[PDB]
Amino acid sequence: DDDKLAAAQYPVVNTNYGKIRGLRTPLPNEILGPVEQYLGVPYASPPTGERRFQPPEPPSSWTGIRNTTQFAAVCPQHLDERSLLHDMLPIWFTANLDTLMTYVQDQNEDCLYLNIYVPTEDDISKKPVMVYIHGGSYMEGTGNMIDGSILASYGNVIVITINYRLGILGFLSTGDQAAKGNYGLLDQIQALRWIEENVGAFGGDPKRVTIFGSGAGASCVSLLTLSHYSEGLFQKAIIQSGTALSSWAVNYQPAKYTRILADKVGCNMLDTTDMVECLRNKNYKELIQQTITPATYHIAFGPVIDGDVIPDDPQILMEQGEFLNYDIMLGVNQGEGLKFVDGIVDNEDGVTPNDFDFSVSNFVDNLYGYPEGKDTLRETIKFMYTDWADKENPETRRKTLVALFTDHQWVAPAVATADLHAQYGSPTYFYAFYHHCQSEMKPSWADSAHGDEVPYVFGIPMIGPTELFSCNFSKNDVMLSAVVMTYWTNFAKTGDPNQPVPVAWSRYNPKDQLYLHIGLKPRVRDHYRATKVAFWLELVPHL
Amino acid sequence: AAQYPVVNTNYGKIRGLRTPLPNEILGPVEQYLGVPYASPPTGERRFQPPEPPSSWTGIRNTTQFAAVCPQHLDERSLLHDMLPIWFTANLDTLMTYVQDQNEDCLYLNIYVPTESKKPVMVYIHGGSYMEGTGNMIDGSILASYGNVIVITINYRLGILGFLSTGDQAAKGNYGLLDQIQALRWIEENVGAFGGDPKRVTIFGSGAGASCVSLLTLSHYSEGLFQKAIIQSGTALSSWAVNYQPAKYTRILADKVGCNMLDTTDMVECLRNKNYKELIQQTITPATYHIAFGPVIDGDVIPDDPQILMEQGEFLNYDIMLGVNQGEGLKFVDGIVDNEDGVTPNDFDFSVSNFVDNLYGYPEGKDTLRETIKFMYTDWADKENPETRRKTLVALFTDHQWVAPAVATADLHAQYGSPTYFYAFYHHCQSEMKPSWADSAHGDEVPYVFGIPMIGPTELFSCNFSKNDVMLSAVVMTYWTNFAKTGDPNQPVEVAWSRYNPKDQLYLHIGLKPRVRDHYRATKVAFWLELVPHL
Ligand SMILES: *[C@@H]1O[C@H](CO)[C@@H](O)[C@H](O)[C@H]1NC(C)=O
Ligand SMILES: *[C@@H]1O[C@H](CO)[C@@H](O)[C@H](O)[C@H]1NC(C)=O
Ligand SMILES: *[C@@H]1O[C@H](CO)[C@@H](O)[C@H](O)[C@H]1NC(C)=O
Ligand SMILES: *[C@H]1O[C@H](CO)[C@@H](O)[C@H](O)[C@H]1NC(C)=O
Ligand SMILES: [Cl-]
Ligand SMILES: [Cl-]
Ligand SMILES: [Cl-]
Ligand SMILES: [Cl-]
Ligand SMILES: [Cl-]
Ligand SMILES: [Cl-]
Ligand code: NA
């Protein structure tokens, strides 16, 4: 280096595709060191024209030095704001999205970019790498929305956020060879390949890559641990409030929704090859502006069992042992399913016996459909989710309904995953998350909800302002963020959330079933919601 | 001499005895033993309702127990293995009471304290309708301690009390009608003993509690008592009522040479048999059921007890009822290992058999079996073999005692009739009880009758401490306050709140008595609400 100061302030890295120039970025927090930011790094060719509804290809090489100093365009996205998938998004998701200048007026089908946050800290070795897969129900979001600077600086790990194709463009499938689906997953895989080959140039360790995600990102992470395409690309996974086993994780009726789309957009031809080519040439505004409403608690565009990328049912893939070679941390938040009681809560924060019966009846219609012994099943669910010690209390009735949806959609599938992963000694760690930041939009009576661990994972309380991310942070929030980031980055470094940086988080196994209660008072407990989980995992599959 | 008090009854004068009690600060008691309350149910009056007794001239001695009703003591029986540890598990020391038997057995015993007209507590013994006697309970301590008259009764048992053809040849329920006739006698005569016929409480344990429950639901009981205490039994359990009397009467009649198909001829033939010929026969009912007991006759018991309760027949009475923590102890006989545990195989076997025996085959038997297995598994400690033992005791206790007691209480308290509920959580030290066992079937009886205030007796079967003495005083005060006022808190203690279906307040009775709520509410709702849909 000749101009050593320029080389420090505007660091240049030589990738396999050419040189890029990033930005050394100080962090306002006095005790956090600067990070190098490389924003808008292309990891694949633009999936445009004939590459729409096709797997991603490697990016083009270049000569000279390419600036990677600001966020690239976001993947095209729209979704009906009354959609159940839209209403299940975190309380902070939309407001934070609208903060992004790239989101607001820089959507582009050319969107396969990633963002890299490198600690400037000097190890006097190669740093662990944490790769984040954002949520948003497969339809919305961007890696740009998460600043990985503080996690990187606090943990002395490289943090990478990725953009992958969303919605129709990422997941359209015909259920046959014309459009095999899973484009967004293949994008994630191609990012991980790029990372494997290029992260060494940033001082990163390809042999210590952890993938992590929340919501639909956690479903993606779970699905990647079960695909042969992912092998040798990462060694650890953290799975936050999502799984491969939930009703909205996989689309079992892709052809139906693709046809509904085609007909809304002037592609009424029956031949699937011609229909796909017609959609392939449609202006993308036309496509993403359509409202294709799935059956309740299901998805219209998302991952499919294609027989290749996802060879079979996720339960079967877990039973066959695909994910056993990864160390896995996974968990849930106490009241993920808060939106389940949207509409049915009164001004005294209660629900009526009538509302309860209706809600359970609709739950069974939508999630079980018409199984052997449906009437028995509905009755047994009502019984299990009634508090017989206080059966006239309307506020308790509200709580049990949130519990029903939380248990079924998040808790039982997480525990099933944990049990399938831990059953032969593969390292497994389970958490239940009990804290949430103060937010005026949230009801007083609400527990930790869907997306509420995310501010703690990314160290947002340390950024500076008390009022950010739809939160009002306290000193306890700062402490809890530090606890969480230490566990998460320790895990990335060693596969053990207790090592090397200093309460002991014990390993999960199906026998003792130890889990970390994460809150202001972290503590190891056992058999999380054991009776309700056993209900869903053991009794119900016979009713 | 004052040692031999004479009382004029409506039928003639009787001589009893003034008995000192070992304790000097408990008053003496006058005892009138073997008082006839009905004519002998013999000859043509076998299998007929009881008639009033005959009058007599002069003074008739009522100075010793009369002969008990015929009964066989059989260790092959489950209705025998069911009986309290004190009842029959002590053998040659119970035979003391049951050796002098006679079909002429319609006698009662009266215990009058010597301290206005006194309340009267009338006790109906248990023994599965098949065995026992009032003579086995000495009412002297309860009477003297509570300042109430205590009366124990003998009623026809087994075949002679309960044989029925299921038609008009033998309508059944002779034993219940005996109890009614004793209550009539008491209503008409107890005044001569200083008793108040307007303050009569009936009480019973086990099958005696089932009898009490059934009497609250019979129009024949009207005007004979105002209060009931119902200890560890109901009208609603599988062994309370015989829904198949003709079957078992036919089996008996065939063993004994009464093979006629005409039921009038079969009954008259049975009348001609020696009673010993009858009580000797092994007649084995379906498991958890009875061969000879109360029947739905259309008269004494017009309909299913559930239906009688919903029509409100017992709404006039003030009722105290309860159960013991671990009633169903015998359910796990033979499957508890030397470390007090039960295996998962023995758990699955017990539950499966439980369902075969109590549900037979309802709409969805497999669903039912798997659901019961789920509900009685401790999913937070799935491998613990001692917990597995506890949950089996709980299964049987919940089904046979707790759920039907709560159903009875709810139906009684529904529209504001005074109702009190208890759960009994203490038992005396006994070497033939396992160290891990909770309060079992019959374990409240020594406390109700003040047995710790005398000491270990032959029948009980207990070593007693200071705590047992105090618990007896607590129980006797509640029981006798209730007989006095209808309120266990008032004579003219921890406050025992009324039971209603909303708040569901009950008294935890033990060394630390206290009011709690919603006793085993989840398990009770399982049996009462969900299961009838499975
Ligand atoms: C790269 O960014 C820097 C910083 O603003 C700018 O001076 C330089 O001209 C940029 N290079 C190109 C090719 O845009
Ligand atoms: C009544 O009992 C007394 C006291 O034992 C006795 O003196 C008398 O002979 C008895 N009367 C009879 C048997 O008629
Ligand atoms: C009472 O205690 C004695 C010790 O004096 C013991 O031998 C006996 O077995 C106990 N009795 C019962 C019924 O448990
Ligand atoms: C943050 O708390 C302040 C009071 O300190 C309040 O005015 C504001 O509405 C809160 N913001 C959120 C997003 O909860
Ligand atoms: Cl490119
Ligand atoms: Cl996210
Ligand atoms: Cl639970
Ligand atoms: Cl007579
Ligand atoms: Cl008794
Ligand atoms: Cl319970
Ligand atoms: Na700083």
Curated annotation (Swiss-Prot), chain A:
* Molecular function as annotated in GO: cell adhesion molecule binding; chloride ion binding; neurexin family protein binding; protein homodimerization activity; scaffold protein binding
Tissue distribution is: Expressed at highest levels in heart. Expressed at lower levels in liver, skeletal muscle and pancreas and at very low levels in brain.
Q: Which residues lie on this side of the membrane: Extracellular?
A: 9-543
What's its membrane topology?
A: Single-pass type I membrane protein
Major site of localization recorded for this protein: membrane
Reported effect of changing residue 175 to S?
A: In a colorectal cancer sample; somatic mutation
Annotated GO biological processes are: adult behavior; brainstem development; cell-cell junction organization; cerebellum development; learning; modulation of chemical synaptic transmission; negative regulation of excitatory postsynaptic potential; neuron cell-cell adhesion
Sugar attachment sites are 67, 472
Segment Interaction with NRXN1: which positions? 320-325
Q: Which UniProt keywords apply?
A: Asperger syndrome, Autism, Autism spectrum disorder, Cell adhesion, Cell membrane, Disulfide bond, Glycoprotein, Membrane, Phosphoprotein, Postsynaptic cell membrane, Signal, Synapse, Transmembrane, Transmembrane helix
Q: Which cysteines are joined by disulfide bonds?
A: 75-111, 267-278, 437-471
Where in or outside the cell it occurs: the entry states:
Cell membrane; Postsynaptic density membrane
Q: Which GO terms describe its cellular component?
A: asymmetric, glutamatergic, excitatory synapse; cell surface; dendrite; excitatory synapse; GABA-ergic synapse; glutamatergic synapse; membrane; plasma membrane
How it assembles, according to the record, is: Homodimer. Interacts with NRXN1 in a calcium-dependent manner. Interaction with neurexins is mediated by heparan sulfate glycan modification on neurexin. Interacts through its C-terminus with DLG4/PSD-95 third PDZ domain.
Q: Related disease?
A: Autism, X-linked 2: A complex multifactorial, pervasive developmental disorder characterized by impairments in reciprocal social interaction and communication, restricted and stereotyped patterns of interests and activities, and the presence of developmental abnormalities by 3 years of age. Most individuals with autism also manifest moderate intellectual disability.
* Family according to the record: Belongs to the type-B carboxylesterase/lipase family.
Q: What does the record give as the function of this protein?
A: Cell surface protein involved in cell-cell-interactions via its interactions with neurexin family members.
Stated name of the protein: Neuroligin-4, X-linked
Q: Which organism is it from?
A: Homo sapiens (Human)
Name of the gene: NLGN4X
Full-sequence portion shown in this chain: 44 to 597 of 816
Curated annotation (Swiss-Prot), chain B:
Report the membrane topology from the UniProt record.
Single-pass type I membrane protein
What are its GO biological-process terms?
Answer: adult behavior; brainstem development; cell-cell junction organization; cerebellum development; learning; modulation of chemical synaptic transmission; negative regulation of excitatory postsynaptic potential; neuron cell-cell adhesion
User: Record's superkingdom?
Assistant: Eukaryota
Establish whether keyword Transmembrane is in the entry: yes
Q: Where is the protein localized? A: Cell membrane; Postsynaptic density membrane
Per the record, the similarity remark reads: Belongs to the type-B carboxylesterase/lipase family.
Q: How does it assemble?
A: Homodimer. Interacts with NRXN1 in a calcium-dependent manner. Interaction with neurexins is mediated by heparan sulfate glycan modification on neurexin. Interacts through its C-terminus with DLG4/PSD-95 third PDZ domain.
Could you tell me what this protein is called? Neuroligin-4, X-linked
Annotated source species? Homo sapiens (Human)
| Gene behind this protein | NLGN4X
Q: Which residues of the parent protein does this chain contain?
A: 44 to 597 of 816
